[PDB]
């Protein structure tokens, strides 16, 4: 599992930041960390892919990086309606396809 | 794209339990797709893989010898057969597409679509 | 020599000299008719070798595949066929089965060797 | 679908056809040297590409995947366009100019991958 | 260097143009006709030998037939390091058909022990 | 069928001891072969298998290191050298039939024929 | 290993059943689960193999079977005869090859 | 001969150096190399070996995720990248030549010449 | 890694024994026992190869031997110049290249 901290938290037009780290066989090695978001009684959506892609449909205001063993999500104009749990995934090579680490409950104050 | 699991509820530990989801809007043979748990009060895990042509499958080795995934690309449709379920087993089974890759195609590594989940109680 | 020396052994008594059988595998209208005959034993040669190849069994004489054997080509055990029968008597008894089994092998091997190309495109 | 039935067909509907053109490659005395001549020259031209496979490591295979990165000078495509929208007549057309640039990368791979082999086997 | 330049080359500083040299393996016109027909069956023996001894597709193939020290006891360094292949082939051509035997002995034994492995389940 | 074991006796840790097995009333070369211990107050377990031809051996972890399977099938024989004996390996050694197979007759994957056992006291 | 009762016991003709567990990848994977009948300072007999099949010279009175991970020998005519240590075995793959549990005791009144 | 190791001296942790080494004296290319460590107060540890030609390199596990090993028979020299730098790395870091040979010429298993070492400080 | 007596001594002229010690696995499984001798301050010199084979430029004093899992150096006419810490080292295979002892502190009286 990746480290990834429990919360975060800023007001509405505050950018915000959520890391998680893992080690170099998995997140650092491979360049495919995705970030998920999860709103309360859905399924989570795919938000960020490869380490700064985003899908078609998110806007700018969500992009990512990764150094080292750390990647992160930047949130630039945070809303109100990004209220949702974030997830880190990565690609740790064959034999361990995929390693996701703990939700970060976003709270908007 | 619409992705919707169905399946049974509730079975005792020991017991075996089967999944499916139907999938529609994209082609089904391009994509490969796995199903990937959420425990009631944690996050999120992958557990199993299957490409797009369903030939080679890949799981969490704590279901290795334990879950086979199918597909059948006739009917737009997987399956998780999950046998020996236990109470740690206990979770919202998504259906997901993405995960893998054909070779001749741009890889993912990530999933593009999810469904909402079947909720497996052991 | 020692060629053809296992055609009267039984099948798991022969499959033994399979090299003693591959090594002999190998004035104008008279130099053409010569030419004709070694042409064709290299083209029966090589056709062999490129079925061998499609199959997956390229360089081997005692192919493994992932064919299931229908009890519909033949309905024997493993003692009957390997201790009790020939090669003769076996190449007789299914020789109705023979292209269909070829096709299978060519469709197995065309499965296996794309799923080998996906499994070397991950990482 | 036959003998170059999937010729018009993308590249990766083709590449799974392979069997079928590969098993069409095998099958008075003027006449007798005319139709020697021509099954000579195609057993020959079999031989040359067993033997470049050979060399490169794919002995016995329709498909082998190399060692040898793709440049892009060659050719700079992505998957989706090579793959799924381009034919293979098109392909050939399109780095007809650098085809023995890519032999020569894939037989020196070989000569490296072969020897490094044989230093492993040696170990013990 | 080209075919045969490293032919008064010691075997070590051989055994890297293999594949140039593998290269060039392959009325009055019926007698052109014989030659090409002959390069291809000389191609094709060799091929099957090795087929038949484990090193097809290969140009070095490594095996599991032991040295014998009666073949030529030298210390590695003189056969590879000074002595070209043409004079080892001199130095060995009397054992060479009985290398050959063992290496077909050798491949016939391997091969069935690899079908007794892959029937264990 | 008869298989009578030979050697045996007590033997100081870190020495070495060869067994060996007499076989006969069927053709030894058509039958794989092993060796089985029982320890002198518990079950049996197994220790080490070898073919009918005699090319591929395998052994269980705990000895795989210290013995050595053989067979000669000109002498109707088994043997087996064990080498740096411990406290652990007192048992009945047990000379059996069966255990493999060899491909192209029927599989076995059990033991048909039992010796009388070698007693090897450490 | 495999997990046996340490001892069973029976009227001497009522049928008794010796269980044998183990686990998914190796007496749940394969039909190879072998029965052997040893009496007190004798070597062990053949009495099942496979699952179900007896060498011949087995009378009838020894059967068996399996199911998910669980197998059982069942001797039906109980007899005086039979009182001996009984073995299951299992195949467990190639790796492992065998596994046994410890012997039943099987206890004749 | 000679190996002069010009690698380096402290780092703060979670660093990374990278160590070099000159040969001269003998044919470089003909040939393996490897690094060796020398703890301030211990032992030696074998950290990695580099084959005549580059093209094979081997790590002890303790650093096979962190460090880099590689040759340029170019300018007869060694170079060793080395990344995480955690505490256990500190040692002296020797340049030797040996510890394999190339299947065309006489075994090795064992360091034929050292260097000097770098003293590498976390 | 292998076994090694932390000191050995004697008087000058009178030889020594440096053992080494290892498993089944290694030592006693490959014939490539080296023997180092390091002086402080200085890089290690190569004295003993393979099994009892010494490097040109190495004297005959120095000799060894290998039996079972135990090897060892033999210094004969011990000199005052042998003060140094001498290493055993093995050959472990290709998953595990090679292994080291501990010092041997040789004290000349
Ligand atoms: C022919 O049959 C007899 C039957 O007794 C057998 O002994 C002999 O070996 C057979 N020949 C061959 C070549 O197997
Ligand atoms: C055997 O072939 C028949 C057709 O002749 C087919 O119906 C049957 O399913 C096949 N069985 C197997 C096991 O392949
Ligand atoms: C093959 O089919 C023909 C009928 O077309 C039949 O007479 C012959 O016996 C068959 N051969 C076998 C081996 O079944
Ligand atoms: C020819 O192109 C059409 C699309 O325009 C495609 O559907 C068809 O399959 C192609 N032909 C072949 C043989 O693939
Ligand atoms: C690609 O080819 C160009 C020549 O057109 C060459 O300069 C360049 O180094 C090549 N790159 C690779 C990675 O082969
Ligand atoms: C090959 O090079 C020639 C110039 O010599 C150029 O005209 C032609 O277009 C090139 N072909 C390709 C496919 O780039
Ligand atoms: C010929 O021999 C000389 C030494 O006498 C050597 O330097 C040279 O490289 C040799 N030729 C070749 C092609 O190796
Ligand atoms: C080596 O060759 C000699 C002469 O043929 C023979 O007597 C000897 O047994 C052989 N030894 C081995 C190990 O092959
Ligand atoms: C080969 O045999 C001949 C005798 O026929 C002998 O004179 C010659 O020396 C032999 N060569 C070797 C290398 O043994």
Same mark, same amino acid.
């Given at each position: 599992?990746?480290?990834? &901290?429990?919360?975060?938290?800023?007001? &509405?037009?505050?950018?915000?930041?959520?890391?998680?780290?893992?080690?170099?066989?998995?997140?650092?090695?491979?360049?495919?960390?995705?970030?998920?978001?999860?709103?309360?009684?859905?399924? &989570?959506?795919?938000?960020?892919?490869?380490?700064?892609?985003?899908?078609?449909?998110?806007?700018?205001?969500?992009?990512?990086?990764?150094?080292?063993?750390?990647?992160?999500?930047?949130?630039?104009?945070?809303?109100?309606?990004?209220?949702?749990?974030?997830?880190?995934?990565?690609?740790?090579?064959?034999?361990?396809?995929?390693?996701?680490?703990?939700?970060?409950?976003?709270?908007?104050? | 794209?619409?992705? =919707?699991? +169905?399946?049974?509820? $509730?079975?005792?530990?020991?017991?075996?339990?089967? $999944?499916?989801?139907?999938?529609?809007?994209? +082609?089904?043979?391009?994509?490969?797709?796995?199903?990937?748990?959420?425990?009631?009060?944690?996050?999120?895990?992958?557990?199993?893989?299957?490409?797009?042509?369903?030939?080679? /499958?890949?799981?969490?080795?704590?279901?290795?010898?334990?879950? /086979?995934?199918?597909?059948?690309?006739?009917?737009?449709? $997987?399956? $998780?057969?999950?046998?020996?379920?236990?109470?740690?087993? +206990?979770?919202?089974?998504?259906?997901?597409?993405?995960?893998?890759?054909?070779?001749?195609?741009?890889?993912?590594?990530?999933?593009?679509?999810?469904?909402?989940?079947?909720? =497996?109680?052991? | 020599?020692?060629?053809?020396?296992?055609?009267?052994?039984?099948?798991?008594?022969?499959?033994?000299?399979?090299? *003693?059988?591959?090594?002999?595998?190998?004035?104008?209208?008279?130099?053409?008719?010569?030419?004709?005959?070694? *042409?064709?034993? *290299?083209?029966?040669?090589?056709?062999?070798?490129?079925?061998?190849?499609?199959?997956?069994?390229?360089?081997?004489?005692?192919?493994?595949?992932? *064919?299931?054997?229908?009890?519909?080509?033949?309905?024997?055990?493993?003692? !009957?066929?390997?201790?009790?029968?020939?090669?003769?008597?076996?190449?007789? !008894?299914?020789?109705?089965?023979?292209?269909?089994?070829?096709?299978?092998? !060519?469709?197995?091997?065309?499965?296996?060797?794309?799923? !080998?190309?996906?499994?070397?495109?991950?990482?």
């Amino acid at each position: 599992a990746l480290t990834q &901290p429990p919360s975060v938290s800023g007001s &509405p037009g505050q950018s915000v930041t959520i890391s998680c780290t893992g080690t170099s066989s998995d997140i650092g090695s491979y360049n495919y960390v995705s970030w998920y978001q999860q709103h309360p009684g859905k399924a &989570p959506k795919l938000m960020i892919y490869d380490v700064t892609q985003r899908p078609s449909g998110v806007s700018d205001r969500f992009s990512g990086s990764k150094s080292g063993n750390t990647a992160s999500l930047t949130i630039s104009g945070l809303q109100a309606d990004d209220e949702a749990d974030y997830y880190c995934s990565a690609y740790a090579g064959r034999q361990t396809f995929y390693i996701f680490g703990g939700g970060t409950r976003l709270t908007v104050l | 794209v619409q992705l =919707v699991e +169905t399946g049974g509820g $509730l079975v005792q530990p020991g017991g075996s339990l089967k $999944l499916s989801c139907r999938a529609s809007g994209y +082609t089904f043979s391009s994509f490969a797709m796995s199903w990937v748990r959420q425990a009631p009060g944690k996050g999120l895990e992958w557990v199993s893989l299957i490409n797009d042509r369903g030939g080679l /499958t890949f799981y969490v080795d704590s279901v290795k010898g334990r879950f /086979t995934i199918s597909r059948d690309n006739s009917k737009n449709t $997987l399956s $998780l057969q999950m046998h020996s379920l236990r109470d740690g087993d +206990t979770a919202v089974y998504y259906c997901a597409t993405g995960g893998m890759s054909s070779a001749l195609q741009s890889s993912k590594y990530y999933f593009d679509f999810w469904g909402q989940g079947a909720l =497996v109680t052991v | 020599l020692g060629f053809l020396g296992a055609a009267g052994s039984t099948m798991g008594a022969a499959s033994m000299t399979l090299t *003693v059988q591959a090594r002999n595998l190998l004035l104008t209208v008279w130099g053409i008719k010569q030419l004709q005959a070694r *042409v064709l034993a *290299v083209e029966r040669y090589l056709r062999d070798q490129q079925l061998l190849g499609i199959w997956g069994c390229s360089g081997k004489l005692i192919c493994c595949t992932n *064919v299931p054997w229908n009890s519909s080509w033949s309905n024997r055990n493993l003692s !009957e066929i390997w201790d009790n029968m020939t090669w003769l008597q076996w190449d007789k !008894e299914i020789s109705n089965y023979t292209q269909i089994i070829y096709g299978l092998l !060519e469709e197995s091997q065309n499965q296996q060797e794309k799923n !080998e190309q996906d499994l070397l495109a991950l990482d």
